[PDB]
Structure formats: structure tokens, C-alpha cells
Amino acid sequence: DQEKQIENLIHAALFNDPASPRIGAKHPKLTLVNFTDYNCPYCKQLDPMLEKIVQKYPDVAVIIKPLPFKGESSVLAARIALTTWREHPQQFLALHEKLMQKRVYHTDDSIKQAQQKAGATPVTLDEKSMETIRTNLQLARLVGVQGTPATIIGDELIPGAVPWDTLEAVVKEKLASA
């Protein structure tokens, strides 16, 4: 309806939600926003690239906005990851990597395995992780996200997985413009 009354709010929630996991610097020149799902095959493909971007360009940070579209285990992996971000932000990256790296559609067991291998402390699930997910979906809508993965890089919304060299080039460019 009247997104018109909230359209100027969109920016802080996209790039600065304290509740959305961040990979990289808190004060970067450029902030990518990666809408993603732990069970989505193209999301898994993209993921290592994003961290490699951050590794190579420390002036870049990446925000993780889970959109758990692929069933209950998508919702659970997302809530667990978001809750780990909230309570133990330092553990998030290792857990996030474990959830993406698993090449089987997730179950309760594999999610618990990822935690174990990542060395992540168990977390209690709250309505808060659910509200963060809802907020993510709201943002996806307003931003024109049509599926996962979808990543905001400067003035572009880039769907799916792209070749690494292409990815790096768009990043350098948006970085130069910043």
C-alpha cells in the first residue's frame, strides 16, 4: 500500500540492521546485501565468493538477509544463524559457512552438525528471529527481490550466482564510485 510512508526508512534497515549478520568491517566503503537461503543451491555457490570479496577488499562488508523459502529446515537454519548472530556474533561466520557448505537439503540433525563443526554455542529461539525474517521479507519486497540469491551491490540488484570475475568487477566499480 503506502510503502510511501516508509520508503525513506528502507536504507538503515537494509545496511545497518543490528540484527542482520555482517561479514567484514562495521564501517565499510561499500555494503553488499545478500538475500539468501541455506538450502538454496545457487546461494551455496555464491556464498564462498562473498567472503572472498571481503577477504580481498576489506573496505567491503556483506549483510546476510535470510529469506527461508525452502521449507521448515530453511526457517530453522535461518533462525539458528540469526540467533547466533545476536548472542555470539563472533561465532556467526563459522556457523554460516557450515550451513552453506552442507550439500544436502537440511534436517534438524544436519543443522545441529553444522553447529558442532562450527563450534557454535547452542541458542534459544525467540520471536525475535521470526521478526527479523519478516523484516527481511518486507525489505526483499520493497527492493524488488524476485528470488534467492539476490544481492544489492551499489545501484544494482544482482539475481542468482554470477561468475567470480564478473562479481569482482561489479564490486570494484561500485567501490570506485563510492
Please give a structural write-up.
This protein has 178 residues and is an alpha+beta fold. It has one domain (1-178): Glutaredoxin. Helices cover 53% and strands 13% of the residues. The chain is built from 7 helices and 5 strands. A 5-stranded mixed β-sheet has the order 1-3-2-4-5. Strand 4 (150-153) and strand 5 form a beta hairpin. Helix 3 (72-87) packs antiparallel against helix 4 (89-101) and helix 3 (72-87) packs across helix 6 (127-143). It is globular.
CATH superfamily: Glutaredoxin
Oligomer: monomer
Task: Fill in the CATH topology.
Answer: Glutaredoxin
Q: Give the helix/strand class.
A: alpha+beta
Would you list the SSEs in sequence order as H and E? HEEHEHHHHEEH
Number of domains: 1
By CATH reckoning, the class would read: Alpha Beta
GO molecular function: disulfide oxidoreductase activity
Keywords: Disulfide bond, Oxidoreductase, Redox-active center, Signal
Protein name: Suppression of copper sensitivity protein
Domain Thioredoxin: 1-176
Can you summarize this structure?
The protein has 7 helices and 5 strands, in the order αββαβααααββα. With 178 residues, it is an alpha+beta fold. Strand 4 (150-153) and strand 5 (156-159) form a beta hairpin.
Give a quick set of tags describing it.
53% helix; 178 residues; Glutaredoxin; 5 strands; alpha+beta; 7 helices; 13% strand; 5-stranded mixed β-sheet
